[PDB]
Amino acid sequence: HMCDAFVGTWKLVSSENFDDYMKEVGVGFATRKVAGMAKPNMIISVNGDVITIKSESTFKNTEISFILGQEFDEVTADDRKVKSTITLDGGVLVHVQKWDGKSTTIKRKREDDKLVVECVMKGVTSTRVYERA
């Protein structure tokens, strides 16, 4: 019952500062423009200890399956090859991606009926709000 309140199908409804986040991460111009238009559907499921997060959009589909605290390989929407670890910290899912000596952290939290996604790269934060689909 670890992630119960995250489970479901979610749709992006708002974004703030995401272009600046992507610039800070090192995403190139054309990818930033196209990826930044996308309104992904995020589908979160749990089967035993394995959590799966899928994102489906016009631009790209992504999928990760993982066990909390156990590092894994991930290919991001912008095609970085990263080493990721996802943990639960006080009810917040904390996702750290490491690549090329860099790091970024994505936090996912339930707030009212929304799922709020905060993406941090150095001094730049972006907030993405999802609602139930």
Ligand X SMILES: O=C(O)CS[C@@H]1Cc2cc(Cl)ccc2Sc2ccccc21
User: Which residue ranges make up the site for ligand X (CB under 6 A)?
Assistant: 12, 22, 27, 35, 38, 40, 55, 57, 59-62, 76-78, 117, 119, 128
The token pair that represents 25 in the structure block: 């991460």
Considering beta carbons, is residue 59 or 99 the nearer one to ligand X? 59
Q: How far is the CB of 59 from ligand X (least distance, A)?
A: 5
Q: How far is the CB of 42 from ligand X (least distance, A)?
A: 6
Alpha helices in 26-75 (DSSP H): 29-37
Considering beta carbons, is residue 1 or 132 the nearer one to ligand X? 132
SS3 11: strand
Is 130 marked as a binding-site residue?
A: yes
Q: What's the distance, Cα to Cα, between the start and end of the chain in Å?
A: 21
* 20 backbone dihedrals φ, ψ, rounded to 5°: -65, -40
Is 32 marked as a binding-site residue?
A: no
